[PDB]
Design an enzyme around this catalytic site. Structure first.
Site, PDB file in Angstrom:
ATOM      1  N   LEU A  10       3.947   4.406  33.611  1.00  0.00           N
ATOM      2  CA  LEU A  10       3.513   3.185  34.271  1.00  0.00           C
ATOM      3  C   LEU A  10       4.321   2.870  35.520  1.00  0.00           C
ATOM      4  O   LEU A  10       5.503   3.194  35.606  1.00  0.00           O
ATOM      5  CB  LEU A  10       3.587   2.026  33.283  1.00  0.00           C
ATOM      6  N   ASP A  11       3.669   2.231  36.485  1.00  0.00           N
ATOM      7  CA  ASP A  11       4.304   1.869  37.743  1.00  0.00           C
ATOM      8  C   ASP A  11       5.420   0.854  37.542  1.00  0.00           C
ATOM      9  O   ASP A  11       5.418   0.097  36.580  1.00  0.00           O
ATOM     10  CB  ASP A  11       3.267   1.320  38.714  1.00  0.00           C
ATOM     11  N   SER A  12       6.388   0.866  38.446  1.00  0.00           N
ATOM     12  CA  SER A  12       7.570   0.028  38.313  1.00  0.00           C
ATOM     13  C   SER A  12       7.242  -1.459  38.265  1.00  0.00           C
ATOM     14  O   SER A  12       7.973  -2.242  37.663  1.00  0.00           O
ATOM     15  CB  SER A  12       8.524   0.306  39.464  1.00  0.00           C
ATOM     16  N   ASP A  68       4.906  -2.688  36.694  1.00  0.00           N
ATOM     17  CA  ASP A  68       4.458  -2.977  35.343  1.00  0.00           C
ATOM     18  C   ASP A  68       5.582  -3.554  34.504  1.00  0.00           C
ATOM     19  O   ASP A  68       5.329  -4.411  33.674  1.00  0.00           O
ATOM     20  CB  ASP A  68       3.916  -1.726  34.666  1.00  0.00           C
TER      21      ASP A  68
END
Lengths: 346, 51, 90, 15, 142, 131, 315, 81, 106, 90
Positions: H37-39, H41
Site C-alpha cells: 500500500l501507498d505511504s 495509506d
C-alpha cells in the site's frame, strides 16, 4: 446592590402579607402572583449556570400552579357568583384549588421540584424559600379548611410523608436533605388541617423555628456536602455539637420541642377516631428521623479525618454574627413544657 | 469583591476541600490532639478582644 | 350551563394538557401557558358580561395584566437558558 | 353533557 | 340561529388544538393569533367590546410579537411544521377527534371607568407589581 | 369498589371474582401509568409490553384473591371471620410469586399481603374509619 | 345593498394607491428638478396600471428554500388589514359607527407589522431575517408612544367614538389646543408607516430592499400597495383627528370636499419629507424615542389629564 | 476494554479498508515492509482507526508504525488498560 | 364580518391571479435564495442579542400599562375625581418611574 | 531537509481528507463523495517527485490556502468543481 435587594425581599414580605390580609379572592391570586415575580430574582443572585435552571424549575411549576388556581376560582364564581373566601360551591372546582395549593406547598406527588430547586441556590435563598414561601398557601388553606374534601387532603398528606421519608435516606449533600425534611413536615401540617387548624399553625411555627436553626448553622459553618460538614468538629466544635441537638429536635425525640407538634397532632386526630392514620404516620416519621441520625454521625458524634490545610483557619474567628440565631435554637428545643401556651393561638 | 476581602475564612472557605489524598489528610486523633494543643496558647481560647 | 362555556373550559383543558405533554425546547411551554391565560380570561369576561355584575368588569383586564406580566418575566429566564445552550428542555 | 359536569345545551342566546 | 358565537367557540378550540400541540413556537404563535381573533370576536358577541379589543390589542398586538422575537433567539435549523412529526400531527388529530365528539354531543364603560375612582387599591398593587417586575427584568439580564 | 362491596357474604364466587379482577386491573393501569411516566421506556412497543405486564399481573392477583376468598367462604362456611380472607391474602402473594419467578418475593408477598387483607376484613367488621 | 357600499369603499381606494404611486414619483421628482414619469401618459397618468400589469404579468417564483404557506399568507394579511382599517372612518358618515373605532384603528395598526415579521421569517434569507427583525423593533418601539399620545389627545374629545370627534371640532380645531402631541403623532405616523427618515424596513441601500426582497411579482405588489394604504390612511386619520371643519348635515358632500384636501395636504408632505432627510440608523431611531419623545409624551399626558379638572372643562 | 477489543478493532478498520487485501493482512508484519500500500495509506487508515478510538494520533506516532501491533500497544498506552 | 370576508376574498383573489397567470418556467438555482450574488454560507440561524429583549421586554411592560391607561377618558366623568385624580397621575408616575429606573441603570 | 516536510504534507492530507465530505455537503456538490477524495490523492500525486529542500514546504504553504478557502466558504461550487476539468474534450 442591597438597596434593591431589600426592596425585593420586602415586596415578597408584602406579597405574602397581602394574602394574609385580603378577603377577596382576586387579591389572593394577586398575592401569590406578586409573590412569584419577586421570588425569582432573589434566587438569581451570584448567578450560576446551575442556578439558572433552578429558577427555571421553580418558575415553571409555580406558574402552572397559579394558573390552575385561578381557573378553579373562576369556576367557583361561575357556580355561586361570589368572591369572598368562605366555602366553595362546586367539588370539581374545589379539588383543583386543593391541587394548586398542593403544588404551592410542594406536597407529593407534586413535590419533585422542591428537592431540585433547593440544590440550585445558596443557603440564604434556600432558607427563605423553605420558610417564607410556606406561609401564603397555608395562609389560604387555613381559610378554606371548612370545605376541603378530607380524603383528598389526607392522601397527599400521607404520601408527602412517605416520599418525604424514602427520598431522605438517599442523599449526601445537605441541602437536598433539608428539602426532604421540609417536604416531610408539610405532610404533618397539611394532615391535621381538615380537623383542626390551630394545630397546623402550631406545627408551622415549630417548623419555621427549626429550619431557621439549621440554616443559620449551615451558614455559620458554610458546610454543604456531608463530608464538608464532617470537618467542622475540630474548627468551632460547638456548632456541630449543636447541630446534633437541632437534628434530634427535627426527629422529635420526646423531651425535645419538635415532639410537641406530633404529640398534639396525634391528639387531635384521635378525637376524630381515625386511629389508624396517625399510627402509620407516626411510624413513618421514624424513617424520617433516621437520616437525621446518619447525618449526625457524619458530624458531631464521630470525627471524620481532618484535612491539614484546616490548621491556619484555626486562627481566624468567624465574623458577621447572625443575631437572631441563639434564640432560634433555644425556642426550637427547650420549649416543651410550654405546650399549653399553644392555646394562645386559639 | 470588597466584602470577599473581609472575613478571610471565606477566601479560605474552599481551601479545606475534602478530597482525602493521603499526604494532606490527617486522621482524627492527630487533629483532635493538635487542635487540643492549639487552644493551649494564651491568645487562642477565645476571640481576641475577650481573652 | 350553556354549551359555549363548556367549550371554553375544554379549551382550557387542552391548554393545560399541551403545557404538560411538554416537549423539546421549552419556548413552546411559555406559549401554551399564555394560551391557558387567554382561556381563563375569556371565560371570566363572558361571565362578568353575563350577570351585569358591573364592578367585576375591572377584573379581567387586571387579571390579564399580571398574567401577561409573569409571562413577560418568563422569556427572560429562557434567555438565560438559551444563552448557554441554544435552548432545549432536554 | 355527561363529561366532568353538565352542559345545559341549546343555543347561546337563551341566557 | 346562526350559532355563530358557538361555531366561533369551535374554531377557538381547534385554535388551541393546533396551538397546544407543539410544533415550533412560531406556528404556535400563529395558533394564538387565530385563537386570539376568534377570542375577541366571541367576547364581542356579548358586547363587552372594549375588552375584546383589549385582548385583540394588548395581547396579540403585544405578546406574540415578542414571541416573534424569542424565535429569533431560539429557532434551530429546520423548524417542524405540524405535519413534520408523528407525535405532533398525531396530537393534532388527537385534539380534533375529541372536540368533534363534543360537537356530536354601556355597562362596560362606567364598569371599567370605576377602576380608578372606586377601586384605588388594585391600581396601587398593579402599579407596584409592574414596576418591580421591570426591576426583576433588570436583575436577571444584568 | 361499591360494586365489589355487595359481595354478599361470598355467594356466587364468580360474581365477586370478576369485581376483584376489575380492581386489580385498575391498580395495574395506574402503576403502569406512573411507571411509564417516570421511567421513559424508549421505543413505545416496549412501553405497552410493560403495561401489559403490570396490568395482567395485578388483574391476576385480584382474580385469584377474590375467588379463593369466596370459595373459602362457601366451603368453610364460617364464613365471616377475617381469616376467611387471609388464605386468599396468602394466596395472592404466590400469584405475585409466580410472575416474578422468585421464591423470596413470593414468600414475603404471601405473608404481608395476607396480613393486609386480614386487616381489611377485620376493618369491615369493625367500621374502622381510615379517613 | 350594503355590499355595494363596501365595494364602493374598496375600489376607489385601490385606485388611490395607484395614483399615489404616480404622484410620489411626480412630486418627489420635481424636488429633484428632474421631471417625473411623463412620456407614457401624456401626463404620466396611464402609468400605474401599466406598472401593475408589468408586475402581475411577470413571473412570481416560489422560492426553493422558503416555506410556502407563511410566504403566501403574509401578503394577504397585509392588504387585508390595510383595507380593513378604512371601514370605521367618518367621511363624514362612517361606514360603521363603532362605539370605539379609534382603538380599533390601533388594533389593525398593531397587527399590521406582524405580517412583516412573517414576511421576513419565511423568506429565509439572511437579509430577510435581519431586516425583518430590526423592522419589528422600530415598529413596536413607536406603537407605545403612539397609543399614549393618541390617548392624551382623546381625553378631551370625550370618547373613543369617531363621529363625535367632528363635533368636538366645530370651531377651533384640536391642533391649537395640543399641537406638540400633534407633532409626536405626526412623526409616529412617519415611522409606524415606515417612511422617510425612519426608513429601515425597506433598508434600501442599507439592506437592499429589506424584508421585501424575496417576494417577486404579485406579493411584492401587495406589500407595496398595502404600504401605501397605510400611508394615506394614517394621513386621513391625522386629518380628521387634528383638523376639524364646518359640517352642514344637509350637504355632507361639502365636508368631504374639504376633507380630502386636508388629508391630501398631509400625504404630500411625507413625500416632501422623503426628498429631504437621510435615514436615522437603528440606534438613533430608537434613541430619540425612548430617551426623548417618550418623556414628553408622559408629561404632556399628565398635563392633559389635569386640564379638564382645573379648567372644569370635562367633555 | 480488553486488549483484544483494541486489536480486533484495528484489524477491523484495516479489513474495511481497500489497499489492504485480506491476504495482505498480517499483524506482526511491518505495515510498509510487507504491505504494498501507498505511504499515504498509513495516514488514511491510522486516521480512520483513531477516528474509531476517537483520539488524535500525534504524527510522531505516525513515525512509530514499525508494526501495526506496536500501534495497538500505543492504543493500550493511551487506554492504559 | 361581511367586509372582512370581502376584503380577504379580494386579496386571495389577487394571489390566485398572481400565481396561476404568468405560466412560465420555474427551475433550480433560479429558485435559490438571494444572497447578493454569491451563495449563502449557511441557512439563517441565531442573530442573538440581549439588546433585543433588554428593551423589548420593557415594551411589553409598558404596553400592559397603557392597557390600564385606556379606561381613563371614561373614568374622567366619575362623580368623585379627587378620589380618582391621584391614581390618574399615580400610574403615570410609576410608568415614568419605571422608565427612569431603566434610564440610568444603563 | 526532507521528511520533516513530508509529515507536514501528511497532516495536510488528513485535513483535506476529513474536510471533504463537509465540502460535498455544504457546497451541495454532486460529485461522488469518494471522487473528491481520490482526486485529492491524485493532486497529491501530482508533485509526488519533488525533491528540493525549501520547495516542498513552500508547496504546503500554497497547499494551506486552498483548504483555507474551502473552509471559509471562499471559492465556490464553480471554483472548487474547477479541478475536475469535466467540460474538456478528451
Amino acid at each position: 446592590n442591597p438597596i434593591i435587594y431589600t426592596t425585593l425581599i420586602m415586596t415578597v414580605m408584602s406579597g405574602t402579607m397581602l394574602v394574609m390580609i385580603s378577603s377577596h379572592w382576586l387579591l389572593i391570586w394577586i398575592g401569590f402572583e406578586m409573590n412569584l415575580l419577586a421570588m425569582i430574582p432573589v434566587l438569581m443572585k451570584n448567578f450560576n449556570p446551575r442556578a439558572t435552571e433552578a429558577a427555571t424549575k421553580y418558575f415553571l411549576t409555580q406558574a402552572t400552579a397559579s394558573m390552575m388556581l385561578m381557573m378553579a376560582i373562576i369556576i367557583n364564581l361561575l357556580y355561586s357568583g361570589q368572591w369572598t373566601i368562605t366555602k366553595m360551591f362546586n367539588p370539581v372546582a374545589m379539588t383543583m384549588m386543593t391541587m394548586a395549593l398542593a403544588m404551592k406547598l410542594g406536597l407529593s406527588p407534586f413535590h419533585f421540584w422542591v428537592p431540585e430547586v433547593t440544590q440550585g441556590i445558596s443557603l440564604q435563598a434556600g432558607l427563605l424559600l423553605l420558610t417564607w414561601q410556606k406561609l401564603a398557601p397555608l395562609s389560604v388553606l387555613c381559610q378554606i379548611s371548612q370545605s376541603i374534601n378530607p380524603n383528598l387532603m389526607l392522601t397527599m398528606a400521607m404520601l408527602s410523608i412517605l416520599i418525604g421519608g424514602w427520598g431522605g435516606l438517599n442523599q449526601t449533600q445537605l441541602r437536598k436533605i433539608m428539602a426532604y425534611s421540609s417536604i416531610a413536615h408539610m405532610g404533618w401540617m397539611t394532615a391535621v388541617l381538615p380537623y383542626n387548624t390551630t394545630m397546623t399553625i402550631l406545627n408551622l411555627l415549630i417548623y419555621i423555628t427549626m429550619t431557621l436553626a439549621m440554616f443559620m448553622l449551615l451558614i455559620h459553618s458554610s458546610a454543604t456536602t456531608t463530608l464538608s460538614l464532617s470537618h467542622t468538629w475540630n474548627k468551632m466544635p460547638v456548632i456541630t455539637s449543636l447541630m446534633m441537638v437541632t437534628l434530634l429536635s427535627m426527629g422529635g425525640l420526646p423531651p425535645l420541642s419538635g415532639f410537641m407538634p406530633k404529640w398534639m397532632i396525634i391528639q387531635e386526630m384521635t378525637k376524630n377516631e381515625s386511629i389508624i392514620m396517625p399510627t402509620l404516620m407516626a411510624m413513618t416519621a421514624l424513617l424520617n428521623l433516621y437520616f437525621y441520625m446518619r447525618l449526625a454521625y457524619s458530624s458531631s458524634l464521630t470525627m471524620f479525618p481532618s484535612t491539614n490545610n484546616m490548621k491556619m483557619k484555626w486562627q481566624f474567628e468567624h465574623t458577621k454574627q447572625m443575631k437572631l440565631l441563639p434564640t432560634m435554637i433555644v425556642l426550637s428545643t427547650l420549649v416543651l413544657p410550654m405546650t399549653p401556651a399553644l392555646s394562645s393561638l386559639n | 469583591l470588597r466584602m470577599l476581602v473581609q472575613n478571610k475564612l471565606e477566601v479560605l472557605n474552599y481551601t479545606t476541600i475534602p478530597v482525602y489524598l493521603p499526604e494532606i489528610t490527617i486522621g482524627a486523633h492527630q487533629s483532635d490532639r493538635v487542635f487540643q494543643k492549639f487552644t493551649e496558647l494564651p491568645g487562642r481560647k477565645y476571640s481576641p478582644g475577650y481573652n | 350551563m350553556p354549551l359555549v362555556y363548556m367549550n371554553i373550559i375544554m379549551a382550557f383543558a387542552i391548554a393545560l394538557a399541551g403545557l404538560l405533554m411538554y416537549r423539546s425546547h421549552l419556548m413552546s411551554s411559555l406559549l401554551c401557558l399564555e394560551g391557558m391565560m387567554l382561556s381563563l380570561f375569556i371565560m371570566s369576561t363572558l361571565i362578568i358580561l353575563n350577570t351585569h355584575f358591573t364592578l367585576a368588569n375591572m377584573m379581567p383586564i387586571i387579571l390579564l395584566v399580571f398574567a401577561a406580566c409573569e409571562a413577560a418575566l418568563g422569556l427572560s429566564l429562557l434567555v438565560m437558558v438559551s444563552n448557554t445552550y441554544g435552548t432545549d428542555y432536554v | 353533557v355527561e363529561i366532568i359536569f353538565k352542559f345545559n345545551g341549546l343555543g347561546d342566546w337563551v341566557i | 340561529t346562526m350559532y355563530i358565537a358557538f361555531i366561533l367557540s369551535t374554531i377557538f378550540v381547534i385554535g388551541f388544538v393546533g396551538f397546544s400541540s407543539k410544533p415550533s413556537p412560531i406556528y404556535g404563535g400563529l395558533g394564538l393569533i387565530v385563537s386570539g381573533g376568534v377570542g375577541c370576536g366571541i367576547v364581542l358577541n356579548f358586547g363587552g367590546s372594549f375588552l375584546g379589543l383589549m385582548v385583540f390589542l394588548i395581547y396579540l398586538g403585544g405578546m406574540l410579537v415578542v414571541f416573534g422575537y424569542t424565535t429569533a433567539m431560539a429557532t434551530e435549523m429546520y423548524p417542524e411544521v405540524w405535519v413534520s412529526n408523528k407525535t405532533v400531527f398525531g396530537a393534532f388529530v388527537s385534539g380534533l377527534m375529541m372536540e368533534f365528539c363534543m360537537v356530536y354531543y354601556s355597562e362596560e364603560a362606567m364598569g371599567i371607568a370605576a377602576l380608578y375612582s372606586y377601586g384605588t387599591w388594585l391600581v396601587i398593587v398593579t402599579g407596584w407589581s409592574l414596576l418591580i417586575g421591570v426591576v426583576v427584568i433588570m436583575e436577571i439580564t444584568r | 369498589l361499591h360494586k365489589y362491596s355487595d359481595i354478599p357474604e361470598g355467594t356466587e364466587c364468580h360474581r365477586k371474582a370478576y369485581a376483584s379482577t376489575s380492581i386489580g386491573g385498575a391498580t395495574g393501569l395506574i402503576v403502569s401509568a406512573y411507571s411509564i411516566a417516570l421511567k421513559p421506556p424508549a421505543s413505545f412497543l416496549e412501553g405497552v409490553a410493560r403495561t401489559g405486564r403490570y396490568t395482567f399481573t395485578s388483574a391476576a392477583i385480584g382474580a385469584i384473591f377474590g375467588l379463593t376468598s369466596c370459595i373459602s367462604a362457601q366451603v368453610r362456611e364460617k364464613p365471616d371471620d377475617p381469616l376467611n380472607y387471609f388464605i386468599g391474602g396468602c394466596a395472592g402473594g404466590l400469584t405475585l410469586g409466580a410472575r416474578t419467578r422468585s421464591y423470596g418475593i413470593g414468600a414475603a408477598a404471601c405473608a404481608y399481603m395476607g396480613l393486609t387483607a386480614a386487616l381489611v376484613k377485620m376493618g369491615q367488621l369493625e367500621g374502622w374509619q381510615v379517613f | 345593498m350594503f355590499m355595494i357600499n363596501i365595494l364602493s369603499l374598496i375600489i376607489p381606494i385601490l385606485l388611490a394607491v395607484a395614483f399615489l404611486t404616480l404622484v410620489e414619483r411626480k412630486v418627489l421628482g420635481y424636488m429633484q428638478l428632474r421631471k417625473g414619469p411623463n412620456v407614457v401618459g401624456p401626463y404620466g397618468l396611464l402609468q400605474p396600471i401599466a406598472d401593475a400589469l408589468k408586475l402581475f404579468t411577470k413571473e412570481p417564483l416560489r422560492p426553493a428554500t422558503s416555506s410556502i404557506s407563511m410566504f403566501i399568507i403574509a401578503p394577504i394579511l397585509a392588504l387585508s388589514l390595510a383595507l380593513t382599517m378604512w371601514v370605521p372612518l367618518p367621511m363624514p358618515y362612517p361606514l360603521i359607527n363603532m362605539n370605539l373605532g379609534v382603538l380599533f384603528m390601533l388594533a389593525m395598526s398593531s397587527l399590521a407589522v406582524y405580517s412583516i415579521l412573517w414576511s421576513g421569517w419565511a423568506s429565509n434569507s439572511k437579509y430577510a431575517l435581519i431586516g425583518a427583525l430590526r423592522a419589528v423593533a422600530q415598529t413596536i418601539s413607536y406603537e407605545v408612544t403612539l397609543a399614549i399620545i393618541l390617548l392624551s389627545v382623546l381625553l378631551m374629545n370625550g370618547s373613543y367614538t369617531l363621529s363625535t370627534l367632528i363635533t368636538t371640532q366645530e370651531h377651533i380645531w384640536m391642533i391649537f389646543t395640543s399641537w406638540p402631541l400633534a407633532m409626536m403623532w405626526f412623526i409616529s405616523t412617519l415611522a409606524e408607516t415606515n417612511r422617510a427618515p425612519f426608513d429601515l424596513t425597506e433598508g434600501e441601500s442599507e439592506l437592499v430592499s429589506g424584508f421585501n426582497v424575496e417576494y417577486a411579482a404579485g406579493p411584492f405588489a401587495m406589500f407595496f400597495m398595502a404600504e401605501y394604504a397605510n400611508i394615506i390612511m394614517m394621513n386621513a386619520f391625522t386629518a380628521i383627528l387634528f383638523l376639524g371643519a364646518s359640517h352642514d348635515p344637509h350637504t355632507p358632500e361639502l365636508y368631504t370636499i374639504n376633507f380630502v384636501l386636508k388629508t391630501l395636504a398631509l400625504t404630500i408632505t411625507f413625500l416632501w419629507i422623503r426628498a429631504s432627510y437621510p435615514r436615522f440608523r437603528y440606534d438613533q431611531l430608537m434613541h430619540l424615542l425612548w430617551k426623548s419623545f417618550l418623556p414628553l409624551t408622559l408629561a404632556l399626558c399628565m398635563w392633559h389629564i389635569s386640564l379638564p379638572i382645573m379648567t372644569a372643562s370635562i367633555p | 476494554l480488553t486488549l483484544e477489543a483494541i486489536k480486533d478493532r484495528v484489524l477491523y478498520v484495516l479489513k474495511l479498508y481497500d489497499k489492504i487485501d485480506p491476504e495482505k493482512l498480517s499483524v506482526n508484519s511491518h505495515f510498509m515492509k510487507d504491505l504494498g500500500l501507498d505511504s499515504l495509506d498509513q495516514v488514511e487508515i491510522i486516521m480512520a482507526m483513531e477516528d474509531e478510538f476517537g483520539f488524535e494520533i500525534p504524527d510522531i506516532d505516525a513515525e512509530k508504525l514499525m508494526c501495526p501491533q506496536e500501534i495497538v500497544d500505543y492504543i493500550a498506552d493511551k487506554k492504559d488498560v | 364580518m361581511l367586509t372582512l370576508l370581502t376584503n380577504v376574498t379580494l386579496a386571495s383573489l389577487l394571489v390566485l391571479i398572481a400565481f396561476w397567470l404568468p405560466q412560465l418556467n420555474a427551475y433550480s438555482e433560479k429558485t435559490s435564495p438571494y444572497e447578493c450574488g454569491f451563495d449563502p454560507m449557511g441557512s439563517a440561524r441565531l442573530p442573538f442579542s440581549m439588546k433585543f429583549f433588554l428593551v423589548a421586554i420593557t415594551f411589553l411592560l409598558f404596553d400592559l400599562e397603557i392597557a390600564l391607561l385606556l379606561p381613563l377618558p371614561w373614568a374622567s366623568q366619575t362623580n368623585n375625581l379627587k378620589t380618582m385624580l391621584t391614581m390618574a397621575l399615580f400610574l403615570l408616575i410609576l410608568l415614568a418611574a419605571s422608565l427612569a429606573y431603566e434610564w440610568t441603570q444603563k | 531537509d526532507m521528511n520533516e516536510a513530508k509529515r507536514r504534507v501528511r497532516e495536510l492530507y488528513r485535513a483535506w481528507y476529513r474536510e471533504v465530505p463537509n465540502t460535498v455537503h455544504l457546497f451541495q456538490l454532486d460529485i461522488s463523495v469518494k471522487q473528491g477524495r481520490d482526486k485529492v490523492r491524485e493532486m497529491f500525486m501530482k508533485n509526488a517527485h519533488v525533491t528540493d529542500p525549501r520547495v516542498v514546504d513552500l508547496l504546503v504553504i500554497k497547499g494551506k490556502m486552498e483548504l483555507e478557502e474551502t473552509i471559509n466558504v471562499w471559492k465556490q461550487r464553480t471554483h472548487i468543481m474547477r479541478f475536475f476539468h469535466e467540460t474538456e474534450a478528451p
